[PDB]
């Protein structure tokens, strides 16, 4: 898969399960248009968001819905969500893994980009 | 100073100097509208963005212009910018820090009571 | 495997390949004794360090040799290595994944602990 | 102040207060020996560990006693402590920061010239 999202919970030391993820792409009029969405699995991973055909060059935003995640665990966190905004596929198709490590008042995000 | 932003560079072990930072507030039509902006100083900090009177409860976004910072250094980065989106709550000082690398960033909020 | 180490390079956006990892365990005289070692693969992962039988309760240190990694890429980094020190298996056997995200003047480390 | 240590708590969004910090230097027999120590202040910082005269080039270790910090808050942590090992080089001020969570930490070094 050309786009995978992995989310981990730094309070529990576990995958962050059932985290909602929304992906948008910038349109020709420079607005964000819905591109794909899903929820992380028991492994903290979200696969199957898109295909190589559909994932053309563009500016993408991966929105990870961290506030809803934390609230369900009894934590009122600082952020509304974690946002990851990047140009994709501007040098040809790549595979992207976006990882996010979550705490209530912090997060870290890292991308691994590979050429298939 | 109810809101301060600090940006650090994890490639060079330094403050991230002259980084543009833009703050937005959510308007009634649920759109983002410009609220304040500036560039980080030689210590990587940006003070004086807003005042207590102006910084009312609401949802804000801080957008740190990391791509241009890395381009100026000749380093290829992943992200267009870093985004920190949060609600201000009167329930008193917010420090938003961001630690920047070319393909990763970490952001932390310190919320303290004067 | 009960102990796995994963290392990523935040400058390149890639797995950190051929990173040396040394694991130690505290001995009865409170000194660090060699426990296992290896190098990360092309995926940034190091498997096969130990077995469930050998990985008894104890205090362990995973030493990730980050300075040698960076120097080979032309970077003189800040740290000598990244150290991860933890009690393991004190509530019965667990599986541990230790991840480290590396930059020249920073690193992040996260553990995922699961019960098999 | 050639060496400062700052510790932050990512669960509460605050400085990490009253955290014990121990600094070691490598001795000639390649063993670690105590060099300096203290506890972080209400701002999460620890100043005054050493002096310019004393902080000569060499390999140092900073060990932040995170387990006891989390135990006092009633939170189960992963690590015994956080360790930052580095060489001091005369090639001038070191700030070591650590952002703490129960199963993760991030550490950053800012090296600046006065």
Author numbering:
A (entry chain A), C (entry chain A): 10 to 125
B (entry chain B), D (entry chain B): 10 to 100, 103 to 125
The paper states:
TTR is an extracellular soluble nonglycosylated tetrameric protein synthesized mainly in the liver, retinal pigment epithelium, pancreas, and choroid plexus. TTR transports holoretinol-binding protein and is a minor carrier of thyroxine (T4) in the blood, whereas in the cerebrospinal fluid, it is the primary carrier of T4 (5). WT-TTR homotetramers or heterotetramers comprised of mutant and WT subunits dissociate into monomers, which can rapidly misfold and subsequently self-assemble into amyloid fibrils. It is well established that TTR tetramer dissociation is the rate-limiting step for amyloid fibril formation.
To test this, the dimer–dimer interface was stabilized with the well-characterized T119M mutation by generating the double mutants R34G/T119M- and K35T/T119M-TTRs. We took profit of the fact that R34G/T119M- and K35T/T119M-TTR double mutants do not aggregate significantly at acidic pH to solve their crystal structures at pH 5.5 at 1.5 and 1.4 Å resolutions, respectively. On the other hand, in good agreement with the molecular simulations, the BC-loop regions (residues 36–40) were remarkably affected in the double mutants, in one or both asymmetrical chains. Indeed, putty-style cartoon representations based on mean Cα β-factors show much greater values in these regions, pointing them as the most dynamic in K35T/T119M and R34G/T119M TTR. The presence of Met119 keeps all those interaction residues virtually at the same positions, which allow the formation of key contacts in the presence of the second amyloidogenic mutation. Gdm.HCl-induced equilibrium denaturation revealed that the double mutants exhibited lower stabilities relative to T119M-TTR, all displaying a single transition, with midpoints Cm= 4.3 M for T119M, Cm = 2.6 M for R34G/T119M, and Cm = 3.2 M for K35T/T119M. Overall, the crystallographic data suggest that BC-loop fluctuations constitute the triggering mechanism for R34G and R35T tetramer dissociation and subsequent aggregation.
